[PDB]
């Protein structure tokens, strides 16, 4: 079952907008909980972007499981070539997806977990394990997660923009609709900021009405593309920036996060208005 | 799927959300529709179900899946799921089922199905848009390219690496079903973000994609306050430069001959040449 892998790790899924920040987000937290205080780690990409685990391995792509089992075949697959080992030992994994077009998107995901829990790609001493999920559409692999309770703390990344918080309600009404069959919860909105004028304002409300809190506000800062030119984390680059401090507060936020609420999503009225209201 | 609007110019929009696809395949249609006084029709293939709203004058459209869920098949008219606006152009919302229930793009195969059964598609109709969700090319999102619904298809993109990835994406679904459909790339549509050098970018991007910039877009705030009057660009200030845009556009596509099979970038490539200008 998805209760028995890694049972001593706090199992997390970052959803939200594509481009909203996730991978930057979900990759930076686990650095600064592997780095600062010293746990084992693990992320497990479900975006088909397959770039969420990329500054973690420095800079080097990770071949998919659906690249591997392509190739390799179901016989010639190994941890080793699914699993790789980055920044203060955490392990990541990509789960790719079929060519555009071709197929549901979010099968790689399914094949991914089911592939790691047989050959055990879950290390039960785990501390925390990471799920960067894509969040443009709640269905197949992408709400899987959610549906089978994969992972029973959920965290959208979203910004001031109406598109991101639409998503940020749509997912929230998948959390709902499986929340008393997978036991799956709401932690809260993380706010990947863009330098808008009352931006917190607008997302504190948002939770407000979505019946949960805006647990960190992380801010826009170009430490994260200097990082990323050095083929490397912020955590990794510099531990001492304010940034990197940033990442270390909302990784402790998490861990010791106990506010899981099911969410209240706002009408698309509601959302509308409280866009204008703001004007951002 | 050849039969439907025979002497139409069947277009489908696609790129990622958020990145003005709603806003330019309405005032695109208003334009073709209030200078040109050509007949058209918007088909709403995108779950935010918004698609439509401008052309009704800010009035909310009621969505197949909707009318189908809490009528019934037997229960269903054209005239509830059909709804004229501006300049006589019809409107319909494909819609979709809640987020975490079955597959997203399933609202676009019953309502194309729906629209085929009732004759919703007016022969006489001069064109034909579908405003399809790009961020996953996958079920009722691909089937415009698979049953060569459209056969003409645009991508509206910034210069922002997330919209030039979707772009690329959906290139690749074009050329899997190229020679099987006959579906085919007309161009990249960019709606500005007003960036230094945003259109030298998309420029060398579209010579990469094998394809070219049809038209340039720029963000205008005229937008904001024609949607803040529950009216289109075209239909607030017909004499505003921004309306004047999407009429060059709407010619542009109404006399493009330049359809192309797309030559998708590789992920080095699309990095290496957001890296060359460095919008971001
Ligand atoms: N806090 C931040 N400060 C500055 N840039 C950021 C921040 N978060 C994300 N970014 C930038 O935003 C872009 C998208 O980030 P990403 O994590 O890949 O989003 P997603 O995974 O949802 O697609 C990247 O270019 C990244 O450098
Ligand atoms: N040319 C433009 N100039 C200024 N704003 C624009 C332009 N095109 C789109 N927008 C704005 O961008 C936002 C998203 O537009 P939208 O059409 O809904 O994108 P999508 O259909 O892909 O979800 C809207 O708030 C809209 O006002
Ligand atoms: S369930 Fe979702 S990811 Fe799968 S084919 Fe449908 S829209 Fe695509
Ligand atoms: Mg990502
Ligand atoms: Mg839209």
Redesign the pocket.
Known sequence: SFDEIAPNAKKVAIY?K????????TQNTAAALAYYYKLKGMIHGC?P?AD?TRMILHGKPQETVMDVLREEGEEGVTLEKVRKVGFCGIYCVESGGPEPGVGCAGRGVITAVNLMKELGGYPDDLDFLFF?VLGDVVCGGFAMPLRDGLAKEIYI?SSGEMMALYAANNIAKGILKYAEQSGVRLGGIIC?SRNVDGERELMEEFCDKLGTKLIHF????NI??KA?FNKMTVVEFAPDHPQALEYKKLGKKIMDNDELVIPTPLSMDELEKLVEKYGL
């Open positions: 939200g594509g481009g909203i920040g996730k991978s930057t987000t975006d972007k969420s960067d990344v990947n992380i801010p826009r800062d994260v593309q990323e």
